[PDB]
Amino acid sequence: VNFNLKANTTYLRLVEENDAEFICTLRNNDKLNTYISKSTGDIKSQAEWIRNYKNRENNGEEYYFIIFRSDDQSPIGTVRLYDFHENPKSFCWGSWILNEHKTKYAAVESALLVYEAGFSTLGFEQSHFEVMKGNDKVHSFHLKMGAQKISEDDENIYYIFPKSKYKENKIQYARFLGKLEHHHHHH
């Protein structure tokens, strides 16, 4: 598989070992890491993590992306598809982080491109993810895009996002993915 994920103000490309420093700094930013897993601040350890990730990637088991800002080709975050299962075909996503240099709507763009990757490039039927209780605006983002709370525990709310909502959204969110081929005009 190779991916061609590009939206209006952002694009994605697969993580390499050399992204270790950017990732370490991102994930150890205390403004950003309130609701994600603790991870090493050691560049070589993060390089190690990426090396193992690359084996999972070579086997079609995981795809991990740096998010970039299109205007200056500068890195603005991460996102990951992982933990694949069957009956029905399901993928998780997460590791979803954008820094201060993000474009205003990078969150909308990157989510949409994740669902491009999962449902159309990779053929999944269903997406699973969770969000910490307390991460209020993230809950509110996913509900708005059409995710459904399946359930919960002491830490998380658990969601699914169906392929049907992705397709059904592709028209509605088309302005985020590219230049419109034609624009609505009212008389």
16 contributes a contact to Mg ion by CB under 5 A: no
Nearer to ligand COA, 53 or 176 (CB): 176
Using the structure block, give the residue that is written with the tokens 């419109």.
180
Residue numbers at the binding site for ligand QUH (CB under 6 A): 23, 35-37, 39-40, 46, 49, 80, 93-96, 129-132, 138
> Which of Mg ion, ligand QUH, ligand COA, none interacts with 23 (beta carbon under 5 to 8 A by kind)?
ligand QUH
Number of other CB atoms surrounding residue 11 within 10 Å: 20
Contact 81, 111 (CB under 8 A): no
User: Are the CB atoms for 5 and 65 separated by under 8 Å?
Assistant: yes
Cβ atoms of 10 and 67 closer than 8 Å? yes
Nearest to 45 by CA among 24, 63, 66, 29: 24
User: x-or-dash pattern for ligand COA, window 54-93, by CB under 6 A?
Assistant: ----------------------------------------
Question: Per-residue contact track with ligand COA, 113 to 152, x per CB under 6 A?
Answer: ------------------x---x-xx--x--xx-------
Q: If you count them, how many residues does the chain have?
A: 187
Tell me which amino acid residue 74 is. S
Binding residues for CoA: 96, 98, 102, 104, 135, 137, 173
